[PDB]
Write a protein of this length. Sequence first.
Lengths: 172, 176, 172, 176, 174, 177, 174, 177
Amino acid sequence: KTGGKISFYEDRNFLGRRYDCDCDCADFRSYLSRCNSIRVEGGTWAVYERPNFSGHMYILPQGEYPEYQRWMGLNDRLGSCRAVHLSSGGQAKIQVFEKGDFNGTTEDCPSIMEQFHLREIHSCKVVEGTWIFYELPNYRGRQYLLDKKEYRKPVDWGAASPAIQSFRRIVE
Amino acid sequence: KTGGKISFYEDRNFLGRRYDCDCDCADFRSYLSRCNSIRVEGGTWAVYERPNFSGHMYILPQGEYPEYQRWMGLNDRLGSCRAVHLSSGGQAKIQVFEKGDFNGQMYETTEDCPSIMEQFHLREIHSCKVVEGTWIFYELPNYRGRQYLLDKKEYRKPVDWGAASPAIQSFRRIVE
Amino acid sequence: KTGGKISFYEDRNFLGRRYDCDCDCADFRSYLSRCNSIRVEGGTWAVYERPNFSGHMYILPQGEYPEYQRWMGLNDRLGSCRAVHLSSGGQAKIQVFEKGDFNGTTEDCPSIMEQFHLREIHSCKVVEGTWIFYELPNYRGRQYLLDKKEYRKPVDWGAASPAIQSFRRIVE
Amino acid sequence: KTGGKISFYEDRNFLGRRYDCDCDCADFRSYLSRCNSIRVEGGTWAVYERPNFSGHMYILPQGEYPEYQRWMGLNDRLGSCRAVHLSSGGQAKIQVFEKGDFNGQMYETTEDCPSIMEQFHLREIHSCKVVEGTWIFYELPNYRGRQYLLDKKEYRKPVDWGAASPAIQSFRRIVE
Amino acid sequence: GGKISFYEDRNFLGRRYDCDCDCADFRSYLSRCNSIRVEGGTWAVYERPNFSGHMYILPQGEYPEYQRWMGLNDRLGSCRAVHLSSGGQAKIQVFEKGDFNGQMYETTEDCPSIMEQFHLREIHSCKVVEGTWIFYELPNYRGRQYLLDKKEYRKPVDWGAASPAIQSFRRIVE
Amino acid sequence: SKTGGKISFYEDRNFLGRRYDCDCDCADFRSYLSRCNSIRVEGGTWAVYERPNFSGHMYILPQGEYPEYQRWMGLNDRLGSCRAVHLSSGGQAKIQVFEKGDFNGQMYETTEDCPSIMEQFHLREIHSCKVVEGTWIFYELPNYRGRQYLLDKKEYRKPVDWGAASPAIQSFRRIVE
Amino acid sequence: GGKISFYEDRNFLGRRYDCDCDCADFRSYLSRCNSIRVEGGTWAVYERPNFSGHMYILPQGEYPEYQRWMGLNDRLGSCRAVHLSSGGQAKIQVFEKGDFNGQMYETTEDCPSIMEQFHLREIHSCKVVEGTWIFYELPNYRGRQYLLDKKEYRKPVDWGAASPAIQSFRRIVE
Amino acid sequence: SKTGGKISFYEDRNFLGRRYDCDCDCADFRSYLSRCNSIRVEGGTWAVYERPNFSGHMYILPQGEYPEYQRWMGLNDRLGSCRAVHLSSGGQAKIQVFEKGDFNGQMYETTEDCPSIMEQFHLREIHSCKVVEGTWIFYELPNYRGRQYLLDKKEYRKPVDWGAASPAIQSFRRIVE
């Protein structure tokens, strides 16, 4: 998905004619008559026996495959491939109960009061992803980082005067 | 993930002495008098005012920061940095359905499953909605057999994967 | 398509947050709020105002674009991109009339007689692509190369004893 | 295209002295006693037995050749190489149709067209089948205006490009 | 910039996992490791995850069988990079007169005025016991620069000076 | 030492004009550059010289980007030679080892690797040690075999201090990097 | 391995086209060229296509305005790389006795037996007028090797030999 | 000279075992490698030495891959230092120029660039010339301005021989690479 490449050799042991794919190729049978060994430098890839992403599909993580049997393959007939994009951003979500612990949406909040009629924030638990509390609204002031765990109060993180008033999501 | 990188410059506009970090640095005061511009070429980084990750912290994601006001810093002192890891392995989950459009019993995990008859007692998987991640179905257990690839979305019948059969007995999460 | 990359900056003059795409990205608005300048190192790219390849689409060859107006853009709203694969292999086709000049399909021929009941080859003209005549059948013996022109007889290329008896297509 | 490369080795199995070509070499006898294996990392190459591209010729496309019998050579003498250029710019063409599913007058070029009213006298393009290449439609002439991207296939109505309007008056071929 | 790469089959084959830094776990990526290529740096490599179990250390080089690093099996789970450098290991001796006579003053730390720290006008000879040092003609690290990347220097010209006028010096780190 | 590092000289300010790249040491590039008003240092630390064959005023340039020569405390724009500074990463690395615990008994001091305690000294076991510079590797068996323990710049009153569950140590090496 | 890169706007902006070799045309890719970065090699750059019109030659360096290479306008259409190297430019003088006395014999070509070509047992001094040469103790380019990468050598030890036994020599090319 | 080139030494045959990379000149890697049984040469030509500080038997290794040391005519497997051979690309490059056509009249010979024919000689025009080594650039105007003509290793009986439509030539440079 970023820094990924895959190379198909017509012969075992990374010999013969060779076809290199960075992104997806619907059909490369015009370049290779067979494929008996594959190097995948980056990323994970799905390779299909036949073109336009049809046929038996095998999955190849990065690694070095000198015989098709090494990628569970059946014969030596492949014709198309596609890079799989592992979901970079995932379960970005968070809950805030502010004062104390509890009962006192998933996208950034510039204004504690505007986006949510909550005075301040004094408790909160993470579900997935990493979040960043900002002291003043608009994401200004001191920054504090929260992994995907659960925090009991402004002391479960570092902010003596819990003056949190904004929150952004990490994305990678 | 790994493979990140970040370069700190002495002067504004990516000029002066330059220190390149590719992992975490408990001290770069023996290299850089000050910091006045940053280039993040990969990853997300946590930069610190003082060595050993003390002082004020600023979170920098990829990009080109020609002034320290551009990462909202209070001055040009920095002495340590750490790479925020974004939770990947340990982020995805799945729900598999016994009877077509999500009828029958609804089973769910975020682990894997080498034998669904052993793990879940089902023989065939007729449907499923993947909450998060990308997954692989294999016709037979122990992960051998025909493979079908599933991304984050829903599957009313076994149509979207590449078959007209329900036949599967193992699946696995992709982490790289 | 091979050795291509594109970088979106949220600020003019290649400043600010930056998102890098190798292959296609259906949606990157979670990474960039705006886009005011683009570097495309390799290949040509289509960028769409909105995600999943919808909206106004602009085309960017490799080059360096410091304001959106420089890629004919309208505002600073882009959300998805796709690399365009310029057809590598094209009008691979050829005609053979053998003896003399004339009246005496587009894929390789191991056997002059088997694939076509033609004795030998003594004339031929190219339409598109590069072809390679082989002396003996099965692509053996002397090799001769033909660009996409038109040849009058075995002397329009180099093969005194015109013993051509096979033909392969170039692919790049 | 350009960006190719090819490496010649003295011994079999990619061993011995190594000469790397990235463009055409009229002589490499002052470098390599012999040639017994080749690695083509990019491009398609024409290798020659004698310097100044004389002698027997063998055509090598990307790949790993550990013996000279593997490129069907007669022995290990080589002294020159030249990079077969595969005809790109000058390979594609288009046919544009005045009336829906290819009714009306049928017009065709392989050049470009900055103003189709000027070039062809049509006001709107309702259909077209692209024989070869990838092309760009712009709503207005001189290539400004809305852009739609077309690959090699057919278009019954103006549906496959991104509009419900026929409005166009310029188009261009992509060469890179 | 170090790199280490784990292979699940002998002779650099199978699935491959790459580290640029420490890694507390690879069990999710590789099930066995039977060979390694270390392209930068030297690594502590551990049997289980979280840097535990038995530890083998690996410098640059290509290891095609786990025995070739003395491992007892193909089980490995974490690795962190031996980065130890301790740039804190430089010492220099400076003398008032030449050929290492006069008041002699040893320092492991930089010096912005030797007139201030040491009450000396010139330096006429010098021993570098450890490290690499720049000599400045003026205090506050300005003026003519001289690089002392050797052992001993008996008169100023040895470091390529035509005057004993040197007033500050500092160490190069890497 | 060695490994990668690179240096670029521009005729004009802000990284403009004819450019010259030093990969290793070059004693005269006067034939490529008429002067030098800006430098880029990607790798390593360089000494640059006003005149060829490593003479004249020298300035030292670490990694960094120097848009005009006053940024390298330069005096003019005449430069002619470039040397890369090797900054040895393998120098003083001493280690003390004792036959008794808590630093008692016989004590040897050394700076070089040792295939065998019993061969070069007359200790079977090793019960305490001091690391004076560098970082070392202890082995269970002679000739750098057996279990490995990684020892850095600290002190060790008993074996368990370096992780070992016994005093059995019979070889050691220093690290080089 | 040379590279040159054409930009259609001043200051390295706009569409960009890259050459590794000669190129008879860029009109299909760029309409103007207003600045160039030459990262390897030196280039003849031509006004029109097919290496015609006026010619400007460009070595490594970053040219942000076409005037900075002395061009009269932003029109350029082809370029080929000045590769001229003429490795044919090496000459060596060898002498029978030392300090450049004895029979003296000049050659621009290699020599597999100096006993055969020249009727001499040893070489006792030598002048390298141009190029770089290896000296072999035995004929047919075997035996102890000595590298002559300087100007003059008055006795064998100068090239680091402890005997005048040298019997063949050849030039290094690049 | 300078520019990129690299050299790799392996402890064991066929590119196995501990590895050491020389980027520039290294005088003692005995502390990294115990011996050397295979070498990879990516860039340039190297002189390798049996013993440290550039002494012992030396062998010369061009680009290539040498799986055992007999492939570099080696005698044993002791190596200790490495020097990269600089093979000057800018040496003898002579040029003769005449005031008359077909080599008549005054004739100057030179090897260095020349901002002005009228300043350093008393020719206004240039009608013939010989290039004895290298390749040169003729300019219309003094100080390397005006129209450029590219001259290689040949001879030129009249101006049109180098492409020019007139004898107007008033400066010239040699190429360096």
